[PDB]
Symmetry: T
Subunit: 150 residues, 12 copies
């Protein structure tokens, strides 16, 4: 405190962030479950293809999760909160489908992997466009001021 809160500017991003965490928790619980079913004890991460697909689907989602969080917040702050949150939901729903598909079949990971890549690339473009709108005017002005005497 402060007699103002910036919570109302990031609450959709925070909600989509928490949903992402819950989805990652779900993937982790499904791996523990596959370990039980296929009797693959730590420290092993190999076993039958069906176990390896569940393990790998979770590990893939986990590798991309910080990329998702980073670009969600940057796009949400610099471009538009609602648009970023919406691309974020689409990304997470695609990730659920990727995990479910990949667990059934390596080939079934591909369609939802492409949908998740499209949603993440869109977050990347919105983040980039917002950062450009932030930096470009001051930079072009400073260049122009430089050329002004001449």
């Amino acid at each position: 405190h402060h007699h103002h809160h910036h919570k109302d500017e990031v609450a959709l991003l925070a909600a989509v962030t928490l949903l992402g965490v819950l989805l990652q928790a779900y993937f982790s619980l499904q791996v523990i479950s596959a370990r039980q079913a296929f009797r693959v004890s730590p420290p092993l991460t190999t076993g039958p293809p069906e176990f390896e697909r569940v393990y790998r689907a979770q590990v893939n989602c986990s590798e991309y999760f910080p990329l998702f969080l980073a670009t969600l917040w940057v796009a949400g702050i610099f471009f538009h909160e609602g648009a970023a949150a919406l691309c974020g939901l689409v990304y997470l729903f695609a990730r659920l489908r990727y995990f479910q598909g990949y667990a059934r079949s390596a080939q079934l990971r591909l369609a939802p992997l492409y949908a998740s890549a499209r949603a993440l690339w869109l977050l990347v473009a919105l983040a980039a466009l917002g950062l450009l709108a932030h930096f470009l005017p001051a930079a072009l002005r400073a260049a122009l001021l430089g050329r002004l005497r001449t």
Copy 2:
């Protein structure tokens, strides 16, 4: 600048965040050390069970680390900073114990894994409760206003 800083609202979260990073650095240095001791050179991540346990303990802590960070910040902003920071410390101390236990024995990972899951689930619940307190009143009001003419 700005003639105000929101640093004083997130400094415990930032301190617990930095402690988390230092702990992850420690786990990484312990893997490099196990590589030396067991002569397992990159790109290999397999070798004797004792090397694999150290590798896996670090990789597990690393997978969950962004989940920890995400929920720490959301709970700290939307619920209560001190409570979030405290659950965060408990989580990180549990993770230290998980890493140390798992390195000695797969079975010794389990008790501290459960303690870390309890602390992370508590962060999740506090984040959820704070987001509910943020969104629910405006939503119930809007629903009611809708029903008002009738």
Copy 3:
């Protein structure tokens, strides 16, 4: 809204964050490419050393990426934005070199790994120094006030 934005206080951190994401995207696309070249289909993450090095270089960069993001933001907020952003650029350029080197040879990962560790440790020290400057004066004052009657 709010009639003020804290965007101007974190825009360099956000830009370096987005660059980090783009670099991680690049590493991921290079793994997909190595999968094609060496015919290593998911769920496999093993194959010839040359494939394993590309896979491992990406996975290593990915493990450290949240540590990078965490300390970049904490150092940028609590110490100095421009200094944090600069150490961050140096870190990311070192990571590019690590990935390129490791793909050619395990041994070629080492020099740029050390440069990335130096840049990350510097971010850690700046974050720590900023948090100390935040907390230490109030703590020493409170200790002193305690001793004052005596």
Copy 4:
């Protein structure tokens, strides 16, 4: 010779038989092609999953091919030639789809495997019904004649 030919009673069965052979030839040429692509030389029948799927799809089609031929001819002679030939075409088209699907993905073999099983079971039932119509009347008559004095 003979001043009659029974060719006109089995020409659809013979045509569907020849189509089956051509389809098996196709599967064999696709395995030779996969051997070239994946550099798997005889006597090896193992290699990457993608090679093994092509090999296995052909071997599976080959195991069932004599079952197909046997029941096609028995159903065609004892039940109805056109019906047997039609179930036979459906079976072979399902087998093409099984081979193509299985080569892409183990999971993609399943739908067309079920369609081929339905067509083969139908040939089995028609063969059984025709053999029953052949044998049952004489058998029931002989049983009855036996009971007649009494």
Copy 5:
């Protein structure tokens, strides 16, 4: 059509043929069942000895099945239909016992393998004797006619 059918000359052969197909169907369903029980997914044909024995028993029966069909029909047409059908039943019952025995133990395959070989060799001898009775008289006559002038 034709105002005569040759169905009555091959109906026992066709019935024994259909029984052979049903038995091969049974072996195939037992392999699918062993895949489920031992979690061996296609394209794999290896796993624990107990799975491999079920797989191999089916594959062995399948390799010999066209030899069985070929000699059943040739012996049934050229020697005697009832005798061929009877040796055929004995062969198929021996094959059932081979499959059941081999699934329990490699060693238990041997006694019924020998009984199936005896029944198949008998079909071979009957086929050979019928073909000799078909060709030998005309050949000896033609040789004699050749020697007749001299």
Copy 6:
């Protein structure tokens, strides 16, 4: 019975069929012999290359055997019995050479594999030409009758 036999129309096909069976029996006895020599007990089908070549040569001959039988009978009935029987003998002699060559060396399988493929493709073409001669005239007539009013 019947006061006529169609045996005299298929006796060369039946003789070549029986020779094919005897040749497959020979290949099977040679595998049992290689099992003894190299001490490879069922359910194993792997061992030294020299055992695997004998196993594979037999399995290859067995996969193609129903294709051989099918096309031999269709070409023999629809095209010309003596021509089909002759291509059939050539095919079987090529298969003997394939088995003997492959057992000595993978590379030695190739020349006789090509000779067997040429003989089998010739049977396929004769079968196709006979089926065309059977079906084409009635089909062209029916098409023409259709066009006749116009």
Copy 7:
């Protein structure tokens, strides 16, 4: 010495003991022989299933041999010498059959394994019954004497 010998009280146990040793010697000589035949040199204890079965049959007999000796002597001293010696002979003859069966086939070990377990359990029960007869009367008397005043 002593002007008495307790040899006459244990000579059947000693004879059955010596027979057990000779049988274990036989099993050991058969393993050395299997090593020669299958060319499996120490320190290896793995090789083809046929070698492993001979090795394992001997190792199993060896693990149970001290259990046999212990219970033979305890039953022979505390229950009845002739009965213990007789169960002991039955056990050893069952063990010979177990070794011979297991060497031929894993499955053939089972019937004689069960017969050896029945004979060993009988020795266990006789030993237990003899020890009960030894200890129970004095214990029940001491309990009763305790209750006597009351």
Copy 8:
């Protein structure tokens, strides 16, 4: 017979011996059970770590069992029956704990392994002390008698 029995001098040793046998029987039944659960058929003694731990725990107990029996009897006869029997019970209870611990985790074998070693070493020391008391006086006397003339 004999009008005396030495049964009363060894009945505690015999009872502890029989308990040892029953405990070894228990370990063996637990291995058979682990074979069923993990589908590891003889002659295999390898499989998942969880099966191998149960197998190894039993094999370890079995290797030491004759050492236990030997020293139990020697200490019980030459030192003191009750003391030997008591160390023996402690040893066997420690072995139960070793088996149960090792089955859960390799690391959990260690504490009860040390307790079993302490109890076995104590039996060894009591056996040694009893044998010294038996042999030393006569030996020192004989040495002294030798020195006596001088």
Copy 9:
């Protein structure tokens, strides 16, 4: 008690027995030491040949140890105590040499293995000769008494 002890009749056997136990303890401590040196953790019993030789030497000594104990006691009681004890010492010294040799080289196990076999076979022959002297006179007398009337 008893006013006599049979300790003086078996004290050399008991001493040689205890020495055997101490030697087995030594072999076990050397395996634990090889586990440390070669980093082979339980439940593994495989690793480099040098570890496997130490493991196997101990396991071999352990398998034969109950055979040694059994025949030592039977020969010592039924033939001559001092002779049995002496063959026993020779056997144990040969076993020490076997363990030391085998640890250095598989081939170095052979000479001392043969010396241990000679000493054990001698114990076997002395045990057999003592049991014959025990049983043969009464048996020949009983046979003769049977023949006496005639």
Copy 10:
């Protein structure tokens, strides 16, 4: 210098030597090429049979190359330069054929291996015959001179 050169006595040997070196260079370049084609990177010398055959053919030629050089020079100096050079050319041409054959097929190495062995054995015999002509006369003379007085 010297006002004479012994170059004219060994120039054919030197030319055949240089040709041998060029041929070994060729074999080495073909291995580097096979490494590229089959993606087998150093330090690996294993991979598909087709790579291993190229590697092994070169390594075999390399092992025998010093034997070739040694005997070429000794035969060329002690027997006859032109004859040695000619056997040497024949040997090298046989080695080219061995390398080319072995690369295609293990079996194709054999005929040219035998031709190279014949040429090398001939060089050996010429070297031996030349050394005999050098040493035998002086030795027989010295023996004779020894016998001369007598």
Copy 11:
């Protein structure tokens, strides 16, 4: 003897030859050392990549060593002694660097491998040029004399 020595014409070649031998001795001692460090006992030539690189570097140097010696002597005799000796030193220094580099990293073998190939190819060209100068004039003269009458 001889009242002249050709030692002064080859002493630099002999010195460079001896240096080559000493360098090969060094490589061999470094392999023995790597065997000790990585516990890889003969007959094994495989182990961790770091051991395999040391082994392979030595084996590669050894394969090329006779090519080096052959061309060093031929170039030194037929072209120029000092030039050959100098290229030889350069080659050997490059080989030292190849061995040292390859031991650290496969990739580090490449630069010095290329330098050694350049020095060896230069020796080859000098040897070829010297042999041409030896043979070409007499050959061109003989061809010309042949053409002279015409």
Copy 12:
């Protein structure tokens, strides 16, 4: 020609060289023989330890053979022919013993390996001493002449 031969100065070196070649031929024939006995076909160089020891013993002798030849000739020319030839015989006899020993046991290679190293090091020292005697006087003279004016 030349009216002198330098054959009489190198005939012992040539004879020892030829003996070395014959010994290498023997080692090669023994490997071909081990391939037959253990059924290890090219391109394989792995199999049971007993085959690998024969292979490795030959390959080791082959690697050192050019070192032997080089130093034999240099020591024989620059130091003393008879001494070099004698060390050479000793070396070759040691190599025979190394091959024979290593084939029986890895450990048995060591004593004769050391004897061969001593003989080869002696050849190295004699070669070095002869080259020093060749070069040192002229070098010291040239240095002295340089210092002479001063």
